[PDB]
Design a protein around this ligand. Sequence first.
Ligand code: W0G
Ligand code: W0G
Lengths: 269, 268
Amino acid sequence: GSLTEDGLSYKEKFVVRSYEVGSNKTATVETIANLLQEVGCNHAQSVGFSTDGFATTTTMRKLHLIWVTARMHIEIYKYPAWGDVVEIETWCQSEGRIGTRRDWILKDSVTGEVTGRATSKWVMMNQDTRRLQKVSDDVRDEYLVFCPQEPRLAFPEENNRSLKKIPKLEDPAQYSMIGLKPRRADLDMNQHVNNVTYIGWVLESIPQEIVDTHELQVITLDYRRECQQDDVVDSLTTTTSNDSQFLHLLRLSGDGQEINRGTTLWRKK
Amino acid sequence: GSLTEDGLSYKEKFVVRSYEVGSNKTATVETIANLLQEVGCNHAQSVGFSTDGFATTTTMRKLHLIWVTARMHIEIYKYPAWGDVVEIETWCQSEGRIGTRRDWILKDSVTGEVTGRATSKWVMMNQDTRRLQKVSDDVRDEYLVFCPQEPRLAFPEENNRSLKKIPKLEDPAQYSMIGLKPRRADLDMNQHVNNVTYIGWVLESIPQEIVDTHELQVITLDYRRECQQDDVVDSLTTTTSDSQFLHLLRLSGDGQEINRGTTLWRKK
Ligand SMILES: CN[C@@H]1CCN(c2ccccc2F)C1=O
Ligand SMILES: CN[C@@H]1CCN(c2ccccc2F)C1=O
């Protein structure tokens, strides 16, 4: 991988592995999400930021401040087949004191066609107190030089799905997968549950028949709270709808505390 | 990746990814196991075998025959750091009518030093009846041309760890992790639980303090039965001792054995 000519974005190619594919012999949405994370981390390393998933500066580390994902939105047109080379371009943009946005474009390396796109909203938070805070000018100035200044949106459209408000699923849920627990492979280098694990947990409550006869086109996921290594989660899904749509909720198995909420849109194969 | 000059082995380089590392900033043993699987699959593709993890020929497919792992043995000296390039060489050897053996050597791409080694025993089985077959003659002839004929062993030493008999853990276990279930990410392209998931499940019953103060040096795992997508598993561990543990994975209901193994850990 490498930063592009103007130094305001980063590109990397990946060859889809045998264990990275599903029953269709194409990469799963979790393989895609891991690759978006990988190219994001390589972009942070290329310009001197921390590489632990928190993209900190020396200034942020002294204050115990980290960047955390508030929302992830992914849209896939074609999942790359096993052995295919997918090229991913990523960039970051500040959104004032709200936080930052990281976008991605996925392309087939052979044809050059856009096979997918993703956008994510990030907020700053104290690592220890978990208290959110707006971005200071001193912190902002450290990353503005690595971002394009004119707007560059992976989702430019007026009424695009990436900014839609997600409602809270009401009990009873139509489907559920109960008692989900993370294992050591689900943790990152900081012993925190990887954001991609939550995508897998959301998808666990989708009936196998939907998975066997449909392809996932869009997934939007809001992150409210993190699941600890010793927490137990319940994944809930209700059909909201040629296309199928679902509303999702991940909540702690005991008290029912919300950890995530989201929507999925599936198209008939 | 590519087959070597003599066409009797296969090599491939891998760059360790950010999500592939543990709390030590080095690749986990599950990342290693996935990479061994990947290079094995690429070797099968390179010479015309099936790429679904069963390494079948047109002859085996007609008979509904597959290759299945009976034992996996991995020894790691140095886990590659994130961003490091690890080079892996793999080859296969027939072991008569018993089955086949696939070996691997892991090396640091920068220094050329051997950082690890693995060996695995495979047996032939009918996919549907799950009944073992003592290989054939026409099936054997199909793969002998892709294997070295003189012995080439990743673990040459007589009476080494890779061939040790593993005993059955007795109740009560000293440690346990109960109610483990596979999710869709744990399945392969055939909707079967990936062999690497069982390695993760074995390690789940090792106390966090062992993991925090030790490095895994050797893992030997016997595979007796497959866990279905709707099965629930209990992982049991007892200290036998460097630290050594005896392991058992059994179905949560009836207690039916799915795997047994041993791990050897070194103080950091
Ligand atoms: C998570 N958002 C952060 C904010 C700074 N940042 C970033 C900006 C430009 C280049 C590389 C970078 F890592 C992020 O990715
Ligand atoms: C599982 N063991 C099988 C038996 C044949 N085989 C093999 C041999 C040489 C080259 C490529 C190969 F796939 C295996 O790996």
